[PDB]
Amino acid sequence: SGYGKDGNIGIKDEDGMNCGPIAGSCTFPTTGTSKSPSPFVDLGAKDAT
Amino acid sequence: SGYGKDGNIGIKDEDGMNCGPIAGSCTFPTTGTSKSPSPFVDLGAKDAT
Amino acid sequence: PLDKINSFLLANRIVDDEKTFTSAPYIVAGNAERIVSGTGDRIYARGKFADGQPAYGIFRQGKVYIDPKTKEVLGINADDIGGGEVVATEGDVATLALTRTTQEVRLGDRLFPTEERAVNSTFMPGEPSREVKGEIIDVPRGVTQIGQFDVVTLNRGQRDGLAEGNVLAIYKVGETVRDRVTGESVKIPDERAGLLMVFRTYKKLSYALVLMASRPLSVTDRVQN
Amino acid sequence: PLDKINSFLLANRIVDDEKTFTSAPYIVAGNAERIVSGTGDRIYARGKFADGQPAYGIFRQGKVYIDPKTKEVLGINADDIGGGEVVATEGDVATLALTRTTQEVRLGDRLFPTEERAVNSTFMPGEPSREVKGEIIDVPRGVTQIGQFDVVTLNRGQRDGLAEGNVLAIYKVGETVRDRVTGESVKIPDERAGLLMVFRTYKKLSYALVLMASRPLSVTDRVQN
Amino acid sequence: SEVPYQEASSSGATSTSFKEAALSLEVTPQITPDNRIIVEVKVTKDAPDYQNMLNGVPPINKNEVNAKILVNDGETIVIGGVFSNEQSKSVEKVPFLGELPYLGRLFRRDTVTDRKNELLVFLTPRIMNNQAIAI
Amino acid sequence: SGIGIGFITDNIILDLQLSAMEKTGNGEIVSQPKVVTSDKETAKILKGSEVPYQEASSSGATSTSFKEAALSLEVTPQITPDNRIIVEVKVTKDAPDYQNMLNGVPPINKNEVNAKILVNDGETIVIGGVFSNEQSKSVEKVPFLGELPYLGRLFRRDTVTDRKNELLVFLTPRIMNNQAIAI
Amino acid sequence: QVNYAKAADIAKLFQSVTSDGGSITVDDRTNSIIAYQPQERLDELRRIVSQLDIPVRQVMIEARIVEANVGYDKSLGVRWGGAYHKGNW
Amino acid sequence: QVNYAKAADIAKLFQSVTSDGGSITVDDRTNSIIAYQPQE
């Protein structure tokens, strides 16, 4: 996360998961997500500054 | 658990169990869990710092 | 007359060649006596200056941007300590004592070699040549309209003329707007009471203690005669 | 001069051989007069010391860790009571009277045999040999920068040199960081006014009452000359 | 700026208290012939309290030195100054895992903070008579 | 902090946990105020903040009380010929109370020594100081299991805390006449 | 003219001079005292003036506060709980 | 000049001297007492 204009998109991914995409990760090597609407809305508002 | 930036992922596993994965452990040698969504969301927010 | 010169002499801290030690700063540091200024106190510094010149001049860096087509800044080296002397320590660091001249020396400041320049009170009568005409910028004060006297930095074309002529009168150019006819505003120079005494460091700008006779003039104004 | 020596003599409680009675502590206890200190009061203690030596020195255990490769602690035996004498009781316990010297004797403390050492004021003129150079640690005070005077424990390599040279000057090493160039910090020794008077117990470290001439030096600093 | 205190104590004591958190100089210079001044100067740097802005109990912060000193006109001295050096080290470690060299870092929680703030006030008097006498 | 769990459930349910925490903290605060004073005259340096008390007692006593939790020096030096000063100095280090920030009853914390001493110019003495050595040991044990050597550790709850805080104030006067006389 | 000495103080010195065995004027702005009086008293007062108009000696007082806090705390809670056979400490 | 003694205290000592059987001047800044009086 940043600090001057703090950003930690891990929690943003949490917010996206709230939006409804499928994220699966069984081990650190293996992960995959689909149907993610978080970037266009979450990034736009969060990054409005 | 840490202390400077405290972390005890045992309770995080509790939060994940709240999320809904199947965790079974009948003895200390034997345990297994599946359908865990806790790492991507819980780690992202908890570890945002 | 001598007292006026003494006031300037108190204000004579700015020297030329900021670029030289920007390329080779002598780095001061030290928390053994953690101060950003002292009189006779001990600071340490890294550079050959420790090995070489015992005295040195502590200068903060200002920039005088003239000749916009050439876009050159001949900077201002504000001399922080009046003087200092050294002891040598291993590691290329030094331990110096400081004769302070009103300017705090940042613990992480830039040090430059000592360059003693002789100034006299013989400039008091003045050396007025009118042809020299130029703007003024970059006062350490930074305040517009400073009065009574101040250390000013005349500009570069103005600086070469200064090499010709030491003294000039003050002009404040004020814009007058044709509010009820066109709205156009025309800058008009207003001759201002008070004149500059100029000491010129060739290859740099002119360090001038201007005595302002009442008129408070902006940081940028026309010095002319 | 004698009064300075008297102050040290008041501070001369630390003795060698912590290891010996760590291996064989003389165990003090007693609630008949439940005190952790007294003057002439009665404490009891278990050990042959009751059977044997009537006096003894009460020492708390400090550790002076030098020679990190050898990683040896030669400890500090802080003498609690000035003196004491015994009466013998069955059960190998004893009942003693205590001449107290400012140090409380924990009811469950460790007792060691009495070892009277002669100190003189003849050390006052000093015995300065520069070659001896070493760090300082483990002051009973535990406070860094202690001044005016204090009982310090010079280190072991320093201790052998001490066996050669009694007196040395104070140095406080302070790290100066090149904050605006590299951020690297270089420790620079600063010679400090004030010198140590050293009394050396061979097979242990040197117990030194250092007189600090103003300079407050950290618990670990370079004693050198 | 002068924070006020509304303290209208009913029986005749209206203290609309105030005190300005400000930079200020109160100077009383005495001029000696040899171009020096012994001046009694109160130098105050006071910052407006946050809690005052909070409308709670306002602790304004004052850094002020008041003293009389002798200096020549061309000379600056430190009326006063203070350096505050804060060195804080905190180590938190599970003992067994903390002991491990490669895992102690993974089991030792380290917080080290060094905060050093220094405040210093200088002063220089330039006699204006040097110009006033010639004027 | 640290926990180790061993659990059986199928044959018997036996959960055995060992919970251990170790904390080490070292804090050093070094604050130095320097004041230049004329001979036989009082001077002060103050850095800190003045908590006020709103005590408008109605009948004519408005005590907008205040007191600054600050580092301060109040010095009255007397100069003797042999380059020494006997000075009456009040040295205060007071920290702004938390409870004051709480808007409750504010207990500010004061560490202040006031005393008059004689020192040479090149000499520093301890006006005062205090060392606080806290040694706390607590052992909690079920008696029968605590007795067992290998299981007492597994049945003795040990809390040992050593907190030692020391505060000391030094002073050194450098006569400015050494420069002022030459100036 | 007495720069380092208050004019009133000089007047007191002259009063002491009178006590030894005479008109005094004080100028506050210049701190300058004009005395019309016997020459000998005048000269003695002048010497007193020379002694009094001495620069007051400033000293830089540096008193430093050092606080050291070392804290080591260890706590171990050992727990053995089984409800299967109701044995739990 | 009395550095360790207050000038007023010295004046009191001289007053005691007068009681034994005479002009005193006190300088506060220097704490220096000038006395014009019999030599003894």
UniProtKB/Swiss-Prot annotation, chains A, B:
It is found in: Cell outer membrane. It comes from the Bacteria. Belongs to the bacterial secretin family. PilQ subfamily. Essential for the formation of pili. Involved in the biogenesis of type 4 fimbriae probably by serving as a 'porthole' allowing passage of the fimbrae through the outer membrane. This is Fimbrial assembly protein PilQ. It comes from Pseudomonas aeruginosa (strain ATCC 15692 / DSM 22644 / CIP 104116 / JCM 14847 / LMG 12228 / 1C / PRS 101 / PAO1). The chain holds residues 481 to 529 of 714 of the full protein.
